[PDB]
Every structure is written in C-alpha cells, then in structure tokens.
Amino acid sequence: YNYLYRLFRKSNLKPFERDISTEIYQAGNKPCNGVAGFNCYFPLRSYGFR
Amino acid sequence: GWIFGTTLDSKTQSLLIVNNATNVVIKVCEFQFCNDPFLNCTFEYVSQPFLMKNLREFVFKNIDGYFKIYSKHTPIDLPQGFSALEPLVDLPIGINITRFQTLLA
Numbered sequence A: 001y002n003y004l005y006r007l008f009r010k011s012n013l014k015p016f017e018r019d020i021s022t023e024i025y026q027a028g029n030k031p032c033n034g035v036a037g038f039n040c041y042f043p044l045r046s047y048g049f050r
Numbered sequence B: 001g002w003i004f005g006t007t008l009d010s011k012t013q014s015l016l017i018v019n020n021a022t023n024v025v026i027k028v029c030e031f032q033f034c035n036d037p038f039l040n041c042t043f044e045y046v047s048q049p050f051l052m053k054n055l056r057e058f059v060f061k062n063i064d065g066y067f068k069i070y071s072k073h074t075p076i077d078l079p080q081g082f083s084a085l086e087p088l089v090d091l092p093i094g095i096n097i098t099r100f101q102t103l104l105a
C-alpha cells in the first residue's frame, strides 16, 4: 500500500505537471467539507500489488 | 518580485521570484501569502539579478510545464519605438499557474 495513484480530478493534467494537492473530491451537489461520503471521495487510491 | 500560483494559500505549489540587487532567488514550494516583504520544496534557483528614463519590459509564459521569462532594459510611458526582447530563462517548474501578483519593497 506504499504506492498511490490519483483517481479523481476536476480537469485533465497538463504535460509534465505535478499535482500533489490532496482535497476531497466533489462528485455531487452538497459540499464534502473534508468528510468522505456520498459523492465525496478521497482522490488518492492505493495500489494493491500482490 | 513576483508570486504565481492557483490559490496561493499553501494548498498548491506557488512560484516565488525575488530580487535583492545581488542575486535572483526562485522557488516553487507553497506558503500563505500576504502582500509584500518588508525592509516540501522541490525546485530552487539562484541566478544573477534582473536589475540595472529606463524602461524594463518582461514577458512571462507557461508552456508545457516550462516557465519562460524574456526581458529587455532600454533607455527612453511606452514610446512609439520598436525594441525586441531577449530570453533570460526557461525553468522546468511544471505547475498550474492561473493567478499572480507583484512584490514591492
């Protein structure tokens, strides 16, 4: 679980751009306010290498 | 000096360029910003100052993760003449820049 990848983002990534910011993704209408829930997901998901 | 960034609130990386008549200091890491100086960090650059009636023109652009800076100091309001600008630097910053501000004394 030491490796993570970005799953959710508002827009596409420009070439050679690093996006290290970590804010809860807004996939719905109500704001997440730092709480993961319905239509509110953590963007970084961990690889499950086995 | 100048500051560039998206939100400029220590949530995303923000370019900072400072002149002090001795050298140019350029960094990319993030901090909270409030106006001008008085009296986690990835890229650092130290160079020669961009300093010296006299008109100083600069061009900043962000192409493919490269921050390109061109400049020209000329002796002379913008006059009717024509003067080209020579490239100073092409830094590999690689950040998302949408807003900027200037830094006075």
Ligand SMILES: *[C@@H]1O[C@H](CO)[C@@H](O[C@@H]2O[C@H](CO)[C@@H](O)[C@H](O)[C@H]2NC(C)=O)[C@H](O)[C@H]1NC(C)=O
Binding pocket: A010, A011, A012, A013, A014, B006, B096, B097, B098
């Ligand atoms: C750089 O950051 C700005 C600011 O967040 C991004 O502009 C946002 O773009 C998304 C989708 O394109 C919109 O939903 C937001 O409303 C925009 N925000 C603002 C303040 O305009 C911009 O997309 C980012 N650059 C890249 C290449 O992703």
Ligand SMILES: *[C@@H]1O[C@H](CO)[C@@H](O)[C@H](O)[C@H]1NC(C)=O
Binding pocket: B040
């Ligand atoms: C940037 O700073 C934050 C908070 O201090 C920290 O969690 C994070 O690991 C830092 N980034 C790197 C690449 O170490």
